Amino acid sequence: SGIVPQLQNIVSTVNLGCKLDLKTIALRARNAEYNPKRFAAVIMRIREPRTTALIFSSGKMVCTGAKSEEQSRLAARKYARVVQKLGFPAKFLDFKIQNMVGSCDVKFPIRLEGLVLTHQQFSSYEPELFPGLIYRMIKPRIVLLIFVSGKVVLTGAKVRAEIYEAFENIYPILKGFRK
DNA sequence: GAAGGGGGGCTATAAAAGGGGGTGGGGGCTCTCTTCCGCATCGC
Numbered sequence: 001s002g003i004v005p006q007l008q009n010i011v012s013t014v015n016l017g018c019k020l021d022l023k024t025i026a027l028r029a030r031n032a033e034y035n036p037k038r039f040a041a042v043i044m045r046i047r048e049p050r051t052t053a054l055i056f057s058s059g060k061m062v063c064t065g066a067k068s069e070e071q072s073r074l075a076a077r078k079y080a081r082v083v084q085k086l087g088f089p090a091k092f093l094d095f096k097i098q099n100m101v102g103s104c105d106v107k108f109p110i111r112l113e114g115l116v117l118t119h120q121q122f123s124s125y126e127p128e129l130f131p132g133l134i135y136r137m138i139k140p141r142i143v144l145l146i147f148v149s150g151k152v153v154l155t156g157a158k159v160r161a162e163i164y165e166a167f168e169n170i171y172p173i174l175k176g177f178r179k
Numbered sequence: 180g181a182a183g184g185g186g187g188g189c190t191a192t193a194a195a196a197g198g199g200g201g202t203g204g205g206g207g208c209t210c211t212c213t214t215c216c217g218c219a220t221c222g223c
Contacts, residue, residue, distance in 0.1 A: 011193080011195060012194095012195085013196065039198095040196090040197050041196065056196055056197055057197080058197070060196055060197085062194085062195045096195090098195050098196095099192095099195075100193090101192085101193070101194095129190065130190060132191080132192095134191070134192070141193095142193085143192055144192090145191075145192065154192095155192050155193040155194085156192070156194070158194095
């Protein structure tokens with residue numbers, strides 16, 4: 001195909017293995033914001049990795065915004081150290097990547113009306129609700145947002161192989177509905 | 180001050196986290212016959 005999707009966002013969850021005091025973290029953490037009325041977690045941001053992480057009292061933390069697997073793990077470790085630097089016994093346990101978001105362009109307009117007809121079992125095109133066709137691939141459990149402009153967004157992948165594999169499967173299908 | 184324009188939020192997509200709140204599902208017309216009541220009567 002000659003086109004490789006580029007990851008736009010990765011969601012990874014890591015357990016620190018120790019209960020944390022959310023109020024204490026907000027007071028001392030540099031960028032943390034805690035609003036129990038709004039959300040029950042502590043939202044923190046670190047610019048150099050350019051990622052955002054949510055910290056819960058149970059010790060589990062979710063890291064989002066990383067553009068690569070290495071960045072997500074590095075960003076998650078940095079957040080854990082910040083909590084550890086606050087006097088808590090934070091660790092890096094069962095780090096896992098929960099979601100990978102990738103985007104790409106096929107460089108040609110797509111006839112979404114034709115695509116849904118031939119793939120009604122997997123496609124879902126509702127212009128009233130969303131201007132982009134939602135494709136649910138089965139062999140890889142990846143949900144693809146195909147747009148008339150040609151932009152394709154892949155999400156729900158656990159590994160980078162699924163993102164590339166999913167695009168390889170849909171690209172020939174899109175080529176058959178080129179506008 | 181009406182109208183077009185610009186910027187931005189909303190919509191859906193996945194996923195994790197944890198808890199509050201929303202939602203749904205149990206539980207403390209005429210004639211005839213029968214029955215009841217008041218009365219006067221005797222009885223003891």
